[PDB]
From a paper:
At the first branching point in this pathway lies farnesyl pyrophosphate synthase (FPPS). FPPS catalyses the sequential condensation of dimethylallyl pyrophosphate (DMAPP) with isopentenyl pyrophosphate (IPP) and the resulting geranyl pyrophosphate (GPP) with another unit of IPP, eventually producing the 15-carbon isoprenoid farnesyl pyrophosphate (FPP). The binding of an allylic substrate induces an open-to-closed conformational change in the enzyme, which reshapes its active site cleft and thereby fully forms the IPP-binding site. Inhibition of the enzyme has been well established as the mechanism of action of nitrogen-containing bisphosphonates (N-BPs), blockbuster drugs that are widely used against bone resorption disorders.
Human FPPS was crystalized in the presence of FPP, and its X-ray structure was determined at 1.9 Å resolution (Rwork/Rfree=0.172/0.211). Binding of the product at the previously speculated allosteric pocket was unambiguous based on the electron density and anomalous signals. The α-phosphate of FPP occupies the entrance of this pocket, engaged in a H-bond with Asn59 and a quadrupole–charge interaction with Phe239. The β-phosphate sits at the edge of the IPP-binding site, forming salt bridges with Lys57 and Arg60; these residues interact with the α-phosphate of IPP when IPP is bound. The tail of FPP extends deep into the allosteric pocket, making tight van der Waals contacts with the protein surface. Furthermore, FPP binding entails an induced-fit conformational change that has not been observed with other allosteric ligands. The key residues include Tyr10, which swings away from αC to accommodate the tail end of FPP. Essentially, the conformational change expands the allosteric pocket and reshapes its surface for better steric complementarity with the long hydrocarbon tail of FPP. With FPP bound in the allosteric pocket, the enzyme adopts the open conformational state. Therefore, allosterically bound FPP can be considered as a molecular wedge that prohibits this conformational transition via steric hindrance.
Author numbering:
A (entry chain F), B (entry chain F): 10 to 30, 36 to 252, 258 to 349
Write the structure that this text describes.
C-alpha cells in the first residue's frame, strides 16, 4: 500500500482547505498550523484502513467519486482522532519528541495552549462528518462511533495513568488482567475496531451482531499488536524507554509472573529508573527468564488463534478484510 | 429560583450514578471523583436555564416524569460542558483557584492528568444524551448542538490566546471588533445560545429561522453579560485581575479608544504587570476617562436594545423566556 498511502495523503490539502475556510481569521490560521504540524508525519495506517476496508466491502457499482471521497474523509477523521490523542498524551507524559520532531506543546509559544489545540483537532472530526456525511443514512452511527471511540480511549488512558504513575514503581499494579484491560480500551478499540466499524457503517453494514463479530476479531488483533509493540520496545532492531518509564509492559507483566521472591526484588530495585546500568539490569533479567522465547511462542499461538477467530467470525464480511490486517501486524 | 436550583442540584447524584456503573472499575472511580470535584460548587445558571426554558416552552400536558428528567439531564450536560472548559482553562491559564477551591489540576497527584479528566467530562455529555435521549426525535439535533458549542467555544479560546498572550502586552491587538469576536465565540454561544437552543429542540422547535431568531437575542445578551463581567472585575464590590493578566477587557478596549498618545503610553508602561501600584495606576487612568460613566450609559443603551430585540425576534416563543434571562443578567 505505498500507492494507496500516497493517494490518502494527497487528500489532506483538501481536508485542510475545507476546515480552514472574518475576525476569527487568525484563529482559523492557528487551526491550520495545528492540523499541518500534527496530522502529518505518521504512517497513516488507521486511516488507510478505512479506505481499504471500504473498497473491499462495498458493491463495486456503488463506489462513485463522492463515495470514495467520503471514505477518505472518514479515514482522515480517524487520523484526526489519533492526532488529538497524541498531542494530549505527549503533554501528559512530558514527552520531548513525536514522529522524530519536537512535540507540538514543546514548541516555543505553544506550551499548554496545546490543550485547546488538541480539543480543536477532536472537534474537526465532527465538522468533517457533518460537511461530507450529513445526508447519509450512517451519519449518526459514525458520530456515535467516533464519540464512543474517544470515551473508550480516554478511559483506557485513565486506567493507564492510575496503574503506572511516573515516579512511583508499584509492581503490584502490573497484573495481566490490568494489562489486557489497558490495551483493549487505550489502544485496540480506536486502532482496530474504529476504522473497520466505520467502513462497515459506510457500506451499509449496521447490524449489532456483525459489529460484535468483527469487534471480537479486531480487539484480539489489537492485543497482539500492543504485546508485540512492548516486546520490540526492548528487543527490536532500530531505542525505547518503557522500562525507564515504569510502563505496564507485557514484558514486566511476564517477568513478574515468573520471578521468585529474589528476582521480584531485582525488579523492585531496578524498574522505573533513569540510570542505563539499572535498565541494563532488567533487560538482562528478562533474557534470563527467556522472555524473547515466551514472546515467540505467544506470537505463534496468537496467530493461530486469530486465524480461528477469522474462520468463526468474519462471515459475512470478506475474510480478506481481516487477513490484510493480520498480514500487516504479524 | 433558589427552589429550582436545589431540585436541579439534587438530580446530580443520579447523573453520577448512571455514569459510574470489571477491571475498568478503578478508572470509573477516578471518573466519579472528577465529576464530583468539578461539576459541583458553581451557581448552575446555564443548566438551570435548560430546565426553566423547557418548562416555559412545552405544552403542559407533555411534561411527564420522563420529559422532566430528560430536561434536567440536558441541563446537566450543559454543566458538564462548562466543567470541561473550566478544568482545561485553569490548566492553560495557570490558575490557582476556582469557585474558591483549589483548581483540580493543582491537587497533589492530579497535575497534567487533568487534561484527560477534562476529556472525560466532555465525553460524559454524549454518554448521558445517548442513555436518556437516544429514542427522541431531537437526539441528533442535541448531539450536533453540543458539538458545535464546543467548537465555537474552542475557537474563541484560540482567538483569546492569540490576542492576549500572558507576558506580552501588545495593546494593538485589543480592538473592539476583536473583543466582540472573543466574547461571541468563547462565551456567549455556550452560555446563552446553547441552553435555550437545547430546550427549544426538546420542545420540538427545530426550525432554522426560529433558532436564528433566538440566537440573535441570545448572543447580544452574552455580549452585555461579559462587558458587565469586565466592568465589575475592577469596579464591583467583593478582587479581580484582568489588568494584572493582560486581558482583552472591555475596559482596556474603551480606554484605548479614548487615550491620547500620552495616555496610551501610561497604559503601554502599566498594563499587564503584577505590581499593585501599576495596576492602581491603570484603574486611576480608567476613572480619569470616566469609564464607569461610559459603562452606565452602555448598560442603559444595551437594555433598551435587548428589549427591542425581544420585541422583534422572540415570536413565537414566549417573551418570558428571554425576559427571565434579561432580568437575571441586568
Ligand atoms: C483492511 C485492510 C485489508 C487494510 C490494509 C492493511 C493495513 C493498512 C493495516 C494497518 C493496521 C494498523 C492500524 C496498524 C497500526 O500500526 P502502526 O504501526 O501504524 O501503529 P502506531 O501508529 O501505533 O505505530
Ligand atoms: C430562561 C429563564 C427564564 C431562565 C431563568 C433565569 C436564569 C437561570 C438565567 C441565567 C442566565 C445565565 C446563564 C447567566 C450566566 O451567569 P453566571 O453569573 O452564572 O456566569 P459565570 O458562570 O460565568 O459566573
Amino acid at each position: 500500500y505505498a500507492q494507496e498511502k500516497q493517494d490518502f495523503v494527497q487528500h489532506f490539502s483538501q481536508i485542510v482547505r475545507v476546515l480552514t475556510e472574518p475576525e476569527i481569521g487568525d484563529a482559523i490560521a492557528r487551526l491550520k498550523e495545528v492540523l499541518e504540524y500534527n496530522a502529518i508525519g505518521g504512517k497513516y495506517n488507521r486511516g488507510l484502513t478505512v479506505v481499504v476496508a471500504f473498497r473491499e466491502l462495498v458493491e463495486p457499482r456503488k463506489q462513485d467519486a463522492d463515495s470514495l471521497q467520503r471514505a477518505w474523509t472518514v479515514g482522515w477523521c480517524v487520523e484526526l482522532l489519533q492526532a488529538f490523542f497524541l498531542v494530549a498524551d505527549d503533554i501528559m507524559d512530558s514527552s520531548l519528541t513525536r514522529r522524530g520532531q519536537i512535540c507540538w506543546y514543546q514548541k516555543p509559544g505553544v506550551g499548554l495552549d496545546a490543550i485547546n489545540d488538541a480539543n480543536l483537532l477532536e472537534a474537526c472530526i465532527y465538522r468533517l462528518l457533518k460537511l461530507y456525511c450529513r445526508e447519509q443514512p450512517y451519519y449518526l452511527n459514525l458520530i456515535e462511533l467516533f464519540l464512543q471511540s474517544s470515551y473508550q480511549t480516554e478511559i483506557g488512558q485513565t486506567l493507564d495513568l492510575l496503574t503506572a504513575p511516573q515516579g512511583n514503581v508499584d509492581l503490584v499494579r502490573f497484573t495481566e488482567k490490568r494489562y489486557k484491560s489497558i490495551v483493549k480500551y487505550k489502544t485496540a478499540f480506536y486502532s482496530f475496531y474504529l476504522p473497520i466499524a466505520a467502513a462497515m457503517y459506510m457500506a451499509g453494514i449496521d447490524g449489532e451482531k456483525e459489529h460484535a463479530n468483527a469487534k471480537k476479531i479486531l480487539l484480539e488483533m489489537g492485543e497482539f499488536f500492543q504485546i508485540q509493540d512492548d516486546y520490540l520496545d526492548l528487543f527490536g532492531d532500530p531505542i525505547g524507554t518503557d522500562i525507564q518509564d515504569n510502563k505496564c509492559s507485557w514484558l514486566v507483566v511476564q517477568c513478574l509472573q515468573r520471578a521468585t521472591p529474589e528476582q521480584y526484588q531485582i525488579l523492585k530495585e531496578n524498574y522505573g529508573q533513569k540510570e542505563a546500568e539499572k535498565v541494563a539490569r532488567v533487560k538482562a533479567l528478562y533474557e534470563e527468564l527467556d522472555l524473547p522465547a515466551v514472546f515467540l511462542q505467544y506470537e505463534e499461538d496468537s496467530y493461530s488463534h486469530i486465524m480461528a477467530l477469522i474462520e468463526q467470525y468474519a462471515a459475512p464480511l470478506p475474510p480478506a478484510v481481516f487477513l490484510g490486517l493480520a498480514r500487516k501486524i504479524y
